Design an enzyme around this catalytic site. Sequence first.
Site, mmCIF file in Angstrom:
data_model
loop_
_atom_site.group_PDB
_atom_site.id
_atom_site.type_symbol
_atom_site.label_atom_id
_atom_site.label_comp_id
_atom_site.label_asym_id
_atom_site.label_seq_id
_atom_site.Cartn_x
_atom_site.Cartn_y
_atom_site.Cartn_z
ATOM 1 N N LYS A 10 9.221 -0.034 1.656
ATOM 2 C CA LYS A 10 7.817 -0.213 1.238
ATOM 3 C C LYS A 10 6.951 -0.764 2.385
ATOM 4 O O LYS A 10 7.457 -1.276 3.382
ATOM 5 C CB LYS A 10 7.715 -1.112 0.004
ATOM 6 C CG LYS A 10 8.509 -2.399 0.106
ATOM 7 C CD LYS A 10 8.134 -3.380 -0.993
ATOM 8 C CE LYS A 10 8.783 -4.741 -0.769
ATOM 9 N NZ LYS A 10 10.271 -4.640 -0.735
ATOM 10 N N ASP A 40 11.859 15.363 12.646
ATOM 11 C CA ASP A 40 11.175 15.412 11.348
ATOM 12 C C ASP A 40 9.642 15.462 11.528
ATOM 13 O O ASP A 40 8.896 14.731 10.883
ATOM 14 C CB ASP A 40 11.617 14.205 10.482
ATOM 15 C CG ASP A 40 11.175 14.313 9.007
ATOM 16 O OD1 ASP A 40 11.067 15.443 8.460
ATOM 17 O OD2 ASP A 40 10.938 13.248 8.383
ATOM 18 N N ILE A 43 0.801 -1.255 0.000
ATOM 19 C CA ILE A 43 0.000 0.000 0.000
ATOM 20 C C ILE A 43 0.826 1.294 0.000
ATOM 21 O O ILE A 43 0.277 2.395 0.081
ATOM 22 C CB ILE A 43 -1.012 0.035 1.177
ATOM 23 C CG1 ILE A 43 -0.296 0.116 2.549
ATOM 24 C CG2 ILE A 43 -1.937 -1.171 1.089
ATOM 25 C CD1 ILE A 43 -1.210 -0.024 3.750
ATOM 26 N N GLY A 44 2.141 1.157 -0.087
ATOM 27 C CA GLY A 44 3.018 2.303 -0.183
ATOM 28 C C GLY A 44 4.406 1.846 -0.550
ATOM 29 O O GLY A 44 4.865 0.801 -0.092
ATOM 30 N N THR A 45 5.078 2.630 -1.377
ATOM 31 C CA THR A 45 6.437 2.315 -1.783
ATOM 32 C C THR A 45 7.225 3.618 -1.933
ATOM 33 O O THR A 45 6.782 4.541 -2.613
ATOM 34 C CB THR A 45 6.432 1.441 -3.064
ATOM 35 O OG1 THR A 45 7.773 1.246 -3.523
ATOM 36 C CG2 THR A 45 5.575 2.063 -4.186
HETATM 37 C C1 LIG Z 1 1.244 3.647 2.855
HETATM 38 C C2 LIG Z 1 0.027 3.759 3.519
HETATM 39 N N1 LIG Z 1 -0.028 3.457 4.865
HETATM 40 C C3 LIG Z 1 -1.229 3.575 5.568
HETATM 41 N N2 LIG Z 1 -1.358 3.333 6.884
HETATM 42 C C4 LIG Z 1 -0.304 2.989 7.655
HETATM 43 N N3 LIG Z 1 -0.545 2.238 8.689
HETATM 44 N N4 LIG Z 1 0.585 1.995 9.333
HETATM 45 C C5 LIG Z 1 1.576 2.595 8.698
HETATM 46 C C6 LIG Z 1 1.013 3.238 7.668
HETATM 47 C C7 LIG Z 1 2.096 3.936 6.926
HETATM 48 N N5 LIG Z 1 3.343 3.641 7.604
HETATM 49 C C8 LIG Z 1 4.559 4.042 7.226
HETATM 50 O O1 LIG Z 1 5.564 3.687 7.842
HETATM 51 N N6 LIG Z 1 4.647 4.809 6.142
HETATM 52 C C9 LIG Z 1 5.919 5.318 5.642
HETATM 53 C C10 LIG Z 1 5.901 6.820 5.823
HETATM 54 N N7 LIG Z 1 7.279 7.406 5.690
HETATM 55 C C11 LIG Z 1 7.696 7.699 4.282
HETATM 56 C C12 LIG Z 1 7.295 8.676 6.453
HETATM 57 C C13 LIG Z 1 6.000 4.932 4.311
HETATM 58 C C14 LIG Z 1 5.026 5.307 3.375
HETATM 59 C C15 LIG Z 1 5.132 4.905 2.045
HETATM 60 C C16 LIG Z 1 6.219 4.127 1.651
HETATM 61 C C17 LIG Z 1 7.191 3.758 2.576
HETATM 62 C C18 LIG Z 1 7.080 4.159 3.902
HETATM 63 C C19 LIG Z 1 2.988 2.777 8.770
HETATM 64 C C20 LIG Z 1 3.376 3.440 10.123
HETATM 65 C C21 LIG Z 1 3.685 1.408 8.626
HETATM 66 C C22 LIG Z 1 -2.334 3.959 4.902
HETATM 67 S S1 LIG Z 1 -3.976 4.191 5.399
HETATM 68 C C23 LIG Z 1 -4.496 4.658 3.885
HETATM 69 C C24 LIG Z 1 -3.452 4.619 3.031
HETATM 70 C C25 LIG Z 1 -2.273 4.239 3.571
HETATM 71 N N8 LIG Z 1 -1.108 4.133 2.907
#
Ligand SMILES: Cc1nc(Nc2n[nH]c3c2CN(C(=O)N[C@H](CN(C)C)c2ccccc2)C3(C)C)c2sccc2n1
Length: 314
Positions: free
Chosen positions: A21, A127, A15-17
Site C-alpha cells: 500500500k 514490466d 492513497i493506494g492499496t
Molecule cells: C496510489 C497513488 N499514487 C500516486 N502517486 C504516486 N506518487 N508516488 C508513487 C505514486 C504511486 N506509487 C506506487 O508505487 N504505486 C504502486 C504501483 N504499482 C502497483 C505498480 C502502487 C499503487 C497502488 C497500490 C500499491 C502500489 C509511488 C511510486 C509510490 C497518485 S497521484 C494521484 C493518485 C495517486 N495514487
Amino acid sequence: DYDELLKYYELHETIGTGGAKVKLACHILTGEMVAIKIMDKNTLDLPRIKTEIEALKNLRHQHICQLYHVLETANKIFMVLEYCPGGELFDYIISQDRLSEEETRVVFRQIVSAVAYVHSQGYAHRDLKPENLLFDEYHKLKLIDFGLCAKSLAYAAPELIQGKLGSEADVWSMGILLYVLMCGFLPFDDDNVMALYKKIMRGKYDVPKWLSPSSILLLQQMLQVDPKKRISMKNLLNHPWIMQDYNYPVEWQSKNPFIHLDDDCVTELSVHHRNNRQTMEDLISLWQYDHLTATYLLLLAKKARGKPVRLRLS
Ligand SMILES: Cc1nc(Nc2n[nH]c3c2CN(C(=O)N[C@H](CN(C)C)c2ccccc2)C3(C)C)c2sccc2n1
C-alpha cells in the site's frame, strides 16, 4: 511498527492499496511531500521488493521515480519515494481517449530516455506499461515498479514469454505502449490468455486509419516478433519519427548524479551536523538510503522547485 518512520515523516491519507500500500506523507526536516510504499513481511513475493530496492539504489534519473529512504522493522518495509501528483499515464490516456501524434512524441521521448538509461546501467525493466509511468508536479513522466527487473501479458515480448535477451523485450513493450498512446487500445488482446499468447506470436495487429505512415513504420520496427529483426534501443534514440519537430536525439543520459554534489545542500547539512564540508560530503556520498540520503535529495528537489535550501529545524 510506524514508530521509527514517524520520527521523520508526518503520515497522511493512504492513497493506494494493492496485493503493498501507498501512504502520502510530509518529510518533516524539508517540508516536501513524499509517497511511502509499505509492505507487510508476514504476508509475502518478498525478493521482488529486494530486487526493486537494489535497482532503485543504483538507478538515478530525471524520468525514474526516485527512492529517498529505505526502512525495515521486524515485520514491515518502507520505501520512501518521490510523490507524483499527476497519476498514471494509463488514466491520462483513458481521459484523453488517445493522444495525437505530437503529444505522443512528447511523452514517448521521456519513456525512451528512462529505458535507454536503465539499459545503459545493465538492467532491463521487463514490466513496461502505462500503469508503471506517473506524471510528476511538472507533468513529466516517471518510471516506477522495478520488482521484475533483471541484470503483464499484453506488454510482454514473444521471446520473453517463450523463456529464452532483455534489452530487446523492453523495445517490444515500448512498441505496445506507443500503439496504446496513439490508439487508446491494445494491438493484441483477448479474454483468453492462450489466444492472446497466440496473437502475440503471430504479430499481426490492426492499424487504425488515423496513424501517419511514419508512425506505422516505427510501430512495425518495434513490433517484430523476431528480436534480431527488432529495432535496437540505440537506433530508437535518433529514429526519424522520434526526431520529428525536435531535430535532436532523445537525451537519455542522467542529469541526477551520484558523483557531483550540490554545494548549497552540503552547506546546509554541514551546519545541522556541525561538520566540516569535506566530511559532510563523504558522509552523503556513502548513499545509504537512510535519513541523510533522504534529506539531501529532498533539499535538492526543494532547490529544483525554486525554494530556499533550508531545513526546518523545529
Ligand atoms: C496510489 C497513488 N499514487 C500516486 N502517486 C504516486 N506518487 N508516488 C508513487 C505514486 C504511486 N506509487 C506506487 O508505487 N504505486 C504502486 C504501483 N504499482 C502497483 C505498480 C502502487 C499503487 C497502488 C497500490 C500499491 C502500489 C509511488 C511510486 C509510490 C497518485 S497521484 C494521484 C493518485 C495517486 N495514487
